[PDB]
């Protein structure tokens, strides 16, 4: 059976343009545990994405936190693209500083 990932894209600290911060892509509630996660800046791979080690929750679904360092800017768009078997297409979630 396949469980579709739930994705949250958000910053560790309250965003302040010009101020360095951490961008998190938190991915949950998926099975199988094989998953690919890319963090994008203006549509391009951020080459230094630190991925935490995968665990699973009390429902047997897996979770993982991808994160990278970034600097919020008036013009830069950030995203998280996730590839999983439950999804016919890769899923992209843009960073919304209001969520």
């Amino acid at each position: 059976i396949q469980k579709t990932p739930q994705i949250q894209v958000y910053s560790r600290h309250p965003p302040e343009n010009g101020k360095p911060n951490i961008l998190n892509c938190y991915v949950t509630q998926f099975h199988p545990p094989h998953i690919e996660i890319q963090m994008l800046k203006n549509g391009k791979k951020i080459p230094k994405v630190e991925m935490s080690d995968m665990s699973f929750s009390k429902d047997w679904s897996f979770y993982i936190l991808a994160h990278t360092e970034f600097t919020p800017t008036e013009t830069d768009t950030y995203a998280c693209r996730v590839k999983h078997d439950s999804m016919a297409e890769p899923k992209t979630v843009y960073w919304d500083r209001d969520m």
Binding site: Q6, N24, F56
Partner: protein, 278 residues
């Protein structure tokens, strides 16, 4: 937040033709990861995931690492066994998960025990709360159940759970109680977003709290409002704290009738807050 707990989450994924199955074991005290083993490491061994665990000596790590090797065996073997029971082809990837451990009360004795197993993400077999009987999800699991009733496995697990699980938990608590028994109260605030004609979205934010146990609710005129309240899952900030938000859709001009309630054990008093203009 409740009784103290020690829990282990172990998982094995078969990778046919790519070598041994991958094996990962993670340990949690009070929902905080403190120990981890990964088979795809250079020197596969248990490593501390918490500073208060480097208080443990050399013999500890080597011992539990040995346990890890034995477990890897068990997992590979039973992965193959389950391939048998479910009548599946041998070139597929499959997962086997084991979750186990103990919640202990204020007295320091076993309050609740766990022994459960899932195959391909679905329940396989679980020790009931009596710690004496087994819940088996399907026919393939009934085999293991008869086998384990015949062998008296439940008594073995119950003995481990009531015994050394609790003693280890006590030990660990005693070592890490300075960092484990700590609270970070949340910083709360409310944001306002246009949404539609006459409708706005109010969002209550709770940020930077530890532990993760939190309750956020809305309130219309002092009364609890959860109807069509959007709640996101508590998420890690990445530094040890957590975030959560809760949103409601509200008539424009009526925002002053709504309040957000934040409940967290770090707060001396619950937070009540509203959309504060300008």
């Amino acid at each position: 937040a409740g009784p103290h707990s020690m829990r282990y989450f172990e998982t094995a994924v078969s990778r046919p033709g790519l070598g041994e199955p991958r094996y990962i074991s993670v340990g949690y005290v009070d929902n905080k990861e403190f120990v981890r083993f990964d088979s795809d490491a250079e020197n596969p061994r248990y490593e501390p995931q918490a500073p208060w665990m480097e208080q443990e000596g050399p013999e500890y790590w080597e011992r539990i690492t040995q346990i890890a090797k034995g477990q890897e065996q068990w997992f590979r073997v039973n992965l193959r066994t389950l391939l048998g029971y479910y009548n599946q082809s041998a070139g597929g990837t499959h997962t086997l998960q084991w979750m186990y451990g103990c919640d202990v009360g204020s007295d320091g004795r076993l309050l609740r025990g766990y022994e459960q197993f899932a195959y391909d993400g679905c329940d396989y077999i679980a020790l009931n709360e009596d710690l004496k009987t087994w819940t088996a999800a399907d026919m393939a699991a009934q085999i293991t159940r008869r086998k384990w009733e015949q062998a008296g496995a439940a008594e073995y697990y119950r003995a481990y759970l009531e015994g050394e699980c609790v003693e280890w938990l006590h030990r660990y608590l005693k070592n890490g109680n300075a960092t484990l028994l700590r609270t970070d109260s949340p910083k709360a605030h409310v944001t306002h977003h246009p949404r539609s004609k006459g409708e706005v979205t109010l969002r209550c934010w709770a940020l930077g709290f530890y532990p993760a146990d939190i309750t956020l609710t809305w309130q219309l005129n002092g009364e609890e409002l959860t109807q069509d309240m959007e709640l996101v899952e508590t998420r890690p900030a990445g530094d040890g704290t957590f975030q959560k938000w809760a949103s409601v859709v509200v008539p424009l001009g009526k925002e002053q009738n709504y309040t957000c309630r934040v409940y967290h054990e770090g707060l001396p008093e619950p937070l009540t807050l509203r959309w504060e203009p300008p």
